[PDB]
Design a protein around this ligand. Structure first.
Ligand code: GTP
Ligand code: GDP
Ligand code: GDP
Ligand code: MG
Lengths: 219, 436, 440, 184, 36, 44, 428
């Protein structure tokens, strides 16, 4: 019935009320994407090939000679929306262009930080899984990419501290959801050693600077 | 041995600092000429923290004064306690800033920097053992951090190796009356965190409310607003200058208030503030100080503490006193509202007892607090970049200079993540299972 | 001939010794300027100052103390105070910067810059010594130099002087009242060194002396000076039989062989029973039985842990004044008839008794009173385990989120030392458990 | 208790393949979690215990603190995966002079120390999955002049992945080890 | 029940010296007969 | 435990009422003594 | 140890409290600027009861002053004892109630209660032990009767175990001072029943004749008239502040006076009241003092106790005298006329004594009395109100401020049962 540091609520018998809330661990309202505006325009050379293997993306033009400076920041902006005929193109399209081609993932790194933190800032437990898989895939499927992300840990990692210890305390009863990985804390952790194993020296300190719970491997 | 060099930048550093130096000169007993006329010896025992002996019994400060307008620090050098500063420390430019932040970073890149670095060098080196620096400035003007990340990017090269405090005047939440204003709020941040990490954020709107509702001064100028900060600056250094039963220097405050290295937020406060007609009818006891310094009214930052959690509290007191009353401040307010004292820290209060009180007053305190309600201070600036950033209409004045606008857009990304890092440790609890 | 050097480290340790050497000089005839006065004599000579003072050719007594501390303007209080010419200017040694409540700074960064000079002064003080019983240290578990520089001092004193009776006095972080946030870090790190390099570590809490000052001494708003005089009264009673003759003269070596049963259990509980104000002291008689009773009272302990949650192991009673042995035996007998005071079955004897003929000396401006007889109690219970399980709860609560750890790792230590310091604390509780359950 | 058991050449107290492996074991979880499943190199369920605090979350083989399992078997072998984090584990033994004695092995300890109720020693894990053989009859003889009688407790702390904690009568080579005790 | 004053303090005063902080010399002891 | 089935019967026992409120043999005196030295409307 | 918080609301409560703190400063040696120029130590021992203490040897009163409005108590602050009050305890707002119960309790009493309650917690948290509160105010006014009874309700919700006194001036019978007098009187008495445990009824009319027939001074004013209600507020609580052969407090003067919780409306008075010409004509002895204590013309209510029966009597006394003569005389005055004391209480009279008389008198005493005859006052007021509520006179000045006519009906209902309960215990 009280507020806090007043003359009231210092008596021998009082009850009180705290703050409104803290705006963490909570889903944020999404915003319209540049992926949405550019897909209805038909500028994308993509097609939903409804394979009998599941859904796949058929590329009318070959992936090797795409303008990655105009497409990778545009596909990464689609990770912050969850409606099906657009979110699959963001999830599968990023994975398809990451494992195809070389010597062009490097110059598009510094213009990829903004669309990768915006999807992480949504704080919903669905696309944070997706952004953690592409973060693991970004550092692996090219050459000399972990060294590029070392000065950019300050804009990717603050969301990873919030959900780092997100796991299941099922002490004996076995879980079955390791086929599709929804465990945030294992995905944040495994991304951190993927961050540290690449980038060479002066990479453990940049992770230890801002997620202090992390233990620096590769001794 | 332990010593501080005062850097004053802008009108704001110069006007606040000039009031600060007259306070310290009264506290140590130095006349406006520069000699000692004190009535005690402990007013002289540790005067090698802010003053240097010059030949002739003339104590001279250790402040270097920096501004890009010649006019401002002629009033400082002609003030009441104004001739104490040595002329070589007074380092002036010829043209400053105005209107556009984009002007501010595409104006005087490196002209005045190296001149100040020479003065900061000689004054620091001609001494014994540097405790650190302190910097007084405001976040505003026709440059913001435009001169800032221009001039100081040359000084931040090695400066975060020792202690460096910063009493910074954060923008107030009232109106937008600088026309093309919400472009200097976005381009302000960059390295707003990782070069001081001991910033005492001081709002002017909260400065007036303590002058209107607490001090009850009918016509508060900018001068007596600068009197309130000068007490706090003296408060966080009084254990280093004057002896005490429980000593606490700057590092002992910094170690005991900063759990994580990205916490440049220390909302200040001075406990025994009373109106002139009500000073006579005042108890001035240890509980009386504590119920005022923890109160939302006596907070020189426009953030109500009951909007978040105190991550850590400092209680540098002055006088012959107690500290156990502060323990009841947690045990009542914490264990009942656990959202006002962070529970994964067991005890959130550092105390200090410095024997020598402020002048006139018998007893005092100096609160600084790392409350997580400071998320809102960098959120009012957050709705004040987004509001006018997207139009870019009167930014044609900016456009003529117009630097890289990734630097426009990366500064708030290094500010909203700071808010998120405060939102985490406001919502994070001991048993990390029940917030998911 | 018998003697001991006193070491005072930290602002806590320096301030304890100032109200402690005030007692020592007044216990003898020693004035603040060192020299005893030609007119007036405090008593017989007996060369009893030798345990704490060294005699020069000019007729000056000099304390065998080093005031080593990184904080410059608590020693300069001594350097300009009343006890100015008592101490050497080179016995009192200061650093340049504080450790700032950091164990790592007092151990690794600043501590190595002064550890060479303090060991040179300890060696030079002990070189003129002949039959040195041991050392006494005074510190707190919460400071930087009181925990970090203390830890480095025992590391070096263990190899320079070997196995020698190295007593320890310390100030615990209280369960509730605590002046620091990093205090559970410093206490858990300095006990990792105390457990292996301190022969006996006396255990003192601030809240309990706060409690006995307001209740027994009947003073409101007590300060650090009053806690300082209570501690120095006990330390004088610890070294009482070293200077004055008694019916049962008990040595520092006889303390360790009769208090601590196993090499980790050297954490006695301190109790000073006849602590009473002057307006209520001379009214009632103070028998030796009722002050032996007041030693076992829960609230008269100087650490916040009552022995009802534990079991006593060995109790060292140090009586001063007009005390005959026979009524001590009656006081010990009537304690043993109570089943509420639990004694372990592997110590049927239980008690070590020391009688001294010199009553405690009152300081001018103090709050105690002149009593004909007095007692100091050195208990040893398993109840101290709950005083450390709370510290582990305080440590684990903030170490798990790595709070304030970069204030330690950057200053020359690794992160694994924190888990290593909690490790010995995780074993110390189980070491106090395994000496508590009854043999069947 | 494990007293009426024959205590043959093999005895397993924890095996991740079963209904309730942590049945006799006591679980204490604090700022961590326990789970049971991951197939990295061996395609089998291996119990995971890990947390941000190594000395606070653990598992203890006797559930009741008053009950102690009595195993006379001198060799103590567990198969534990290296995770490049802080891992410690306990073993408590009964001695011929009737002293409750404990041993500790840790990743974060530089040098070893021995004194009367706890002996702490360092340990270097391998790159991945390995088995470690804690010879209790020799460690109770080198550390103290004492013979081995029976162990009383084992306790496994955080940041490790567990499968097949067992005792053996003597050290076994890899070939003579049976099929259900192999690493693969 | 009690033979002397030491057992009166030692018996069920319901004062945990580990938990009891800043009491008075009246609430130093709170016997069970006092409560109910 | 040796029991009997002739105990499940309800105990069907009421408490006999207390003796009536003892009128004292000196009550008739204290009515007259209290109602003595009393008049009406003297001072006011 | 046991200290009393002073409350005062409205113009009347501040004019009474202006002279109340004049005599308390005189009894306890406090000067106008708040420094103890006293004589004995007994005037400094129990000084925490009314006066707090501030740095400088200054004794600040614990009183808070309540009104809606800053432009008048030049009577206090420009008076002889107005610098003693701290400026923080003065609480005010913008527009006044102006003799209207609706304005001071609902509209303008909605934003000042937050300010007044903030101040009284500051006065109540600086205590070792709070004995209770007490209020002086008007009963037919706008701020004294409208705001004052709302402050009573707020304290009772927050401090239910504490004792609250009410020194209210009830409406004068013959000549009124406010036209809307019973509207404020009825709505405020109705709240006073369940929210107070010791209520004092004061007629300005009975103060006029006490000033004339006993005090015998020709030209009166509110200075010496408020002095009568001043020393009554002092003299009741002097057992807290000064010792005696057997002393009392506010709690003991309430448990020994209030049989049933709705019966706590009392009548005060003074025994020694003589002029300068009667100093040589009367002997200051206990029989002469106790005679004029029980006199109907001496009472501070304009309703005779002869019309009903006293329920409970108490008197506080002073001076080094015999307990025998004061005990046998109050038996004597109780038994000689038994038609005015209830039969089912054998001893209606309580005796309390102090050792320190006031300055200027060698022995004095204060009377407090619970009688059925205070129903005479309420039953006039009950038909004052049905003369005006029936034709809806002066009702738009209440209905248009947010209240309904049901609250008027509950106030009639509560007052009429309170009258009917008084008449019930008149008959034994
Ligand atoms: N009993 C008693 N305890 C004291 C006194 N002074 C300080 N302490 C203890 O010391 C603690 C404060 O930290 P300190 O150990 O003094 O820190 P320090 O000795 O100055 O060491 P640094 O932090 O490195 O400067 C408090 O928690 C007190 O318990 C004293 O005068 N008497
Ligand atoms: N307290 C205080 N604030 C000032 C003063 N001068 C300016 N400010 C604040 O600083 C803001 C603008 O000052 P600024 O332009 O940054 O001064 P500059 O640093 O010299 O450019 C205004 O909103 C003021 O509130 C002063 O003398 N005292
Ligand atoms: N005894 C006494 N009564 C007073 C005094 N001043 C006013 N009154 C009474 O108070 C009533 C007026 O109420 P008021 O104080 O104006 O109420 P308010 O408007 O709410 O403050 C009148 O009926 C007067 O009889 C005084 O000095 N002494
Ligand atoms: Mg210090």
């Amino acid at each position: 019935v009280s507020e806090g540091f007043t003359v009231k609520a210092m008596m021998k018998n009082s009850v009180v009320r705290g703050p409104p809330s803290a705006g963490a661990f909570k889903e944020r309202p999404t915003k319209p994407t540049a992926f949405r505006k550019f897909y209805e325009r038909g500028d994308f050379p993509i097609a939903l090939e409804h394979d009998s293997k599941g859904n796949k993306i058929a590329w009318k033009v070959e992936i090797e000679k795409l303008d990655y400076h105009h497409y990778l920041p545009l596909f990464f902006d689609g990770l912050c929306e969850m409606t099906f005929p657009y979110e699959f193109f963001a999830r599968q399209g990023i994975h398809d262009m990451l494992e195809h081609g070389g010597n062009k993932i490097l110059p598009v790194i510094p213009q990829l930080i903004i669309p990768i933190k915006n999807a992480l800032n949504l704080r919903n437990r669905q696309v944070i899984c997706v952004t953690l898989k592409v973060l693991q895939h970004l550092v692996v499927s090219a050459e000399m990419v972990g060294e590029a992300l070392v000065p950019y840990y300050r804009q990717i990692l603050p969301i990873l501290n919030i959900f780092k210890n997100k796991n299941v305390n099922s002490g004996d009863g076995i879980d079955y959801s390791q086929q599709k990985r929804e465990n945030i804390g294992d995905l944040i952790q495994e991304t951190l050693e993927a961050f540290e194993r690449y980038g060479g020296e002066d990479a453990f300190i940049n992770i230890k600077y801002m997620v202090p719970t992390y233990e620096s491997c590769l001794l | 041995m332990r010593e501080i060099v005062h850097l004053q930048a802008g009108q704001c550093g110069n006007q606040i600092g000039a009031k600060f130096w007259e306070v310290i000169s009264d506290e140590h007993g130095i006349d406006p000429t520069g000699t000692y006329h004190g009535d005690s010896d402990l007013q002289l025992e540790r005067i090698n923290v802010y003053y240097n002996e010059a030949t002739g019994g003339k104590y001279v400060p250790r402040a270097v004064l920096v501004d890009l307008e010649p006019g401002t620090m002629d009033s400082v050098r002609s003030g009441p306690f104004g001739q104490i500063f040595r002329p070589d420390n007074f380092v002036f430019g010829q043209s400053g800033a105005g209107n556009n932040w984009a002007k501010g970073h595409y104006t005087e890149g490196a002209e005045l920097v190296d001149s100040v670095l020479d003065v900061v060098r000689k004054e620091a080196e001609s001494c014994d053992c540097l405790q650190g620096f302190q910097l007084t400035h405001s976040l505003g003007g026709g440059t913001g951090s435009g001169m800032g990340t221009l001039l100081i990017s040359k000084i931040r090269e090695e400066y975060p190796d020792r202690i460096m405090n910063t009493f910074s005047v954060v923008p107030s939440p009232k109106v937008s009356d600088t026309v093309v204003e919400p472009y200097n709020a976005t381009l302000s941040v960059h390295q707003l965190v990782e070069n001081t990490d001991e910033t005492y954020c001081i709002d002017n709107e909260a400065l007036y409310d303590i002058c209107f509702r607490t001090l009850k001064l009918t016509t508060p100028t900018y001068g007596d607003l600068n009197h309130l900060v000068s007490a706090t600056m003296s408060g966080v250094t009084t254990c280093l200058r004057f002896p005490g039963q429980l000593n606490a220097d700057l590092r002992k405050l910094a170690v005991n208030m900063v759990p994580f290295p990205r916490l440049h937020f220390f909302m200040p406060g001075f406990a025994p503030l009373t109106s002139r007609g009500s000073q006579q009818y005042r108890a001035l006891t240890v509980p009386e100080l504590t119920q005022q310094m923890f109160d939302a009214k006596n907070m020189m930052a426009a953030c109500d503490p009951r909007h978040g959690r105190y991550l850590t509290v400092a209680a540098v007191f002055r006088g012959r006193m107690s500290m156990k009353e502060v323990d009841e401040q947690m045990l009542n307010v914490q264990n009942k509202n656990s959202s006002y004292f962070v529970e994964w820290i067991p005890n959130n209060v550092k105390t200090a007892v410095c024997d020598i009180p402020p002048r006139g007053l018998k007893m005092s305190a100096t609160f600084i607090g790392n409350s997580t309600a400071i998320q809102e201070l960098f959120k009012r600036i957050s709705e004040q970049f987004t509001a006018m950033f997207r139009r870019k209409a009167f930014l044609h004045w900016y456009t003529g200079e117009g630097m890289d606008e990734m630097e426009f857009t990366e500064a708030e990304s290094n500010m909203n993540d700071l808010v998120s890092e405060y939102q985490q440790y406001q919502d994070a609890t001991a048993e990390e299972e029940g917030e998911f | 001939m018998r003697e001991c050097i006193s070491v005072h480290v930290g602002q806590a340790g320096v301030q304890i010794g100032n109200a402690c050497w005030e007692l020592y000089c007044l216990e003898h005839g020693i004035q603040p300027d060192g020299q005893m006065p030609s007119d007036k004599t405090i008593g017989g000579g007996d060369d009893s100052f030798n345990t704490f003072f060294s005699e020069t050719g000019a007729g000056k007594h000099v304390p065998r103390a080093v005031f080593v501390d990184l904080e410059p303007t608590v020693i300069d209080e001594v350097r300009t105070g009343t006890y100015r010419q008592l101490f050497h200017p080179e016995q009192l040694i200061t650093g340049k910067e504080d450790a700032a409540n950091n164990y790592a700074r007092g151990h690794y960064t600043i501590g190595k810059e002064l550890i060479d000079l303090v060991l040179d002064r300890i060696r030079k003080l002990a070189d003129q010594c002949t039959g040195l019983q041991g050392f006494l240290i005074f510190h707190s578990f919460g400071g930087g130099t009181g925990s970090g520089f203390t830890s480095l001092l025992m590391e070096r004193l263990s190899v320079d002087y070997g196995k020698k009776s190295k007593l320890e006095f310390s100030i615990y972080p209280a369960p509730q009242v605590s002046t620091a946030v990093v205090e559970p870090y410093n206490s858990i790190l300095t006990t990792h060194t105390t457990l292996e390099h301190s022969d006996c570590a006396f255990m003192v809490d601030n809240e309990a002396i706060y409690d006995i000052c307001r209740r027994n001494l009947d003073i409101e708003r007590p300060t650090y000076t009053n806690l300082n005089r209570l501690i120095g009264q006990i330390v004088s009673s610890i070294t009482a039989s070293l200077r004055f003759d008694g019916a049962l003269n008990v040595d520092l070596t006889e303390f360790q062989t009769n208090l601590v049963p196993y090499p980790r259990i050297h954490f006695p509980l301190a109790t000073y029973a006849p602590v009473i104000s002057a307006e209520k002291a001379y009214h009632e008689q103070l028998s030796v039985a009722e002050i032996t009773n007041a030693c076992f009272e829960p609230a008269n302990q100087m650490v916040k842990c009552d022995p009802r949650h534990g079991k006593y192991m060995a109790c060292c009673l140090l009586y001063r004044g007009d005390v005959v042995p026979k009524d001590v035996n009656a006081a010990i007998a009537t304690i043993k008839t109570k089943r509420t005071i639990q004694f372990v079955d592997w110590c049927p004897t239980g008690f070590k008794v020391g009688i001294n003929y010199q009553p405690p000396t009152v300081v001018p401006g103090g709050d105690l009173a002149k009593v004909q007889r007095a007692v100091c109690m050195l208990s040893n219970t398993t109840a101290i385990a709950e005083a450390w399980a709370r510290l582990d709860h305080k440590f684990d609560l903030m170490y798990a989120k790595r709070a304030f750890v970069h204030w330690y790792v950057g200053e020359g230590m690794e992160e694994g030392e924190f888990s290593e310091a909690r490790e010995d604390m995780a074993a110390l509780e189980k070491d106090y458990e395994e000496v508590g359950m009854d043999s069947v | 208790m494990f007293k009426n058991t024959f205590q043959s050449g093999f005895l397993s107290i924890l095996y991740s393949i079963g209904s309730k492996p942590l049945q006799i074991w006591d679980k204490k979880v604090r700022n961590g979690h326990i789970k049971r499943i991951t197939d990295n190199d061996i395609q089998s369920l291996v119990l995971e215990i890990e947390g941000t605090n190594v000395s606070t979350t653990y598992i203890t083989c006797p559930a009741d603190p008053k009950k102690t399992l009595g195993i006379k078997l001198p060799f103590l072998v567990m198969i534990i995966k290296n995770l490049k984090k802080y891992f410690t584990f306990e073993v408590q033994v009964l001695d011929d002079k009737n002293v409750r004695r404990r041993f500790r092995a840790s990743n974060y300890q530089s040098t070893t120390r021995v004194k009367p109720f706890i002996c702490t020693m360092p340990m270097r894990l391998d790159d991945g999955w390995n088995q470690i053989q804690f010879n209790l009859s020799d460690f109770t003889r080198r550390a103290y002049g004492t013979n081995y009688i029976e162990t009383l407790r084992v306790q496994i702390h955080a940041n490790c992945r567990i499968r097949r904690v067992y005792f053996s009568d003597r050290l076994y080579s890899e070939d003579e080890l049976p099929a259900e005790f192999k690493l693969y | 029940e009690i033979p002397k004053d030491d057992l009166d303090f030692r018996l069920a005063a319901l004062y945990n010296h580990h938990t009891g902080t800043f009491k008075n010399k009246s609430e130093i002891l709170t016997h069970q007969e006092t409560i109910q | 435990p040796s029991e009997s089935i002739y105990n499940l019967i309800p105990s069907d026992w009421k408490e006999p009422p207390q003796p009536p409120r003892y009128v004292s043999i000196f009550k008739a005196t204290v009515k007259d003594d209290m109602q003595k030295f009393k008049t009406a409307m003297k001072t006011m």
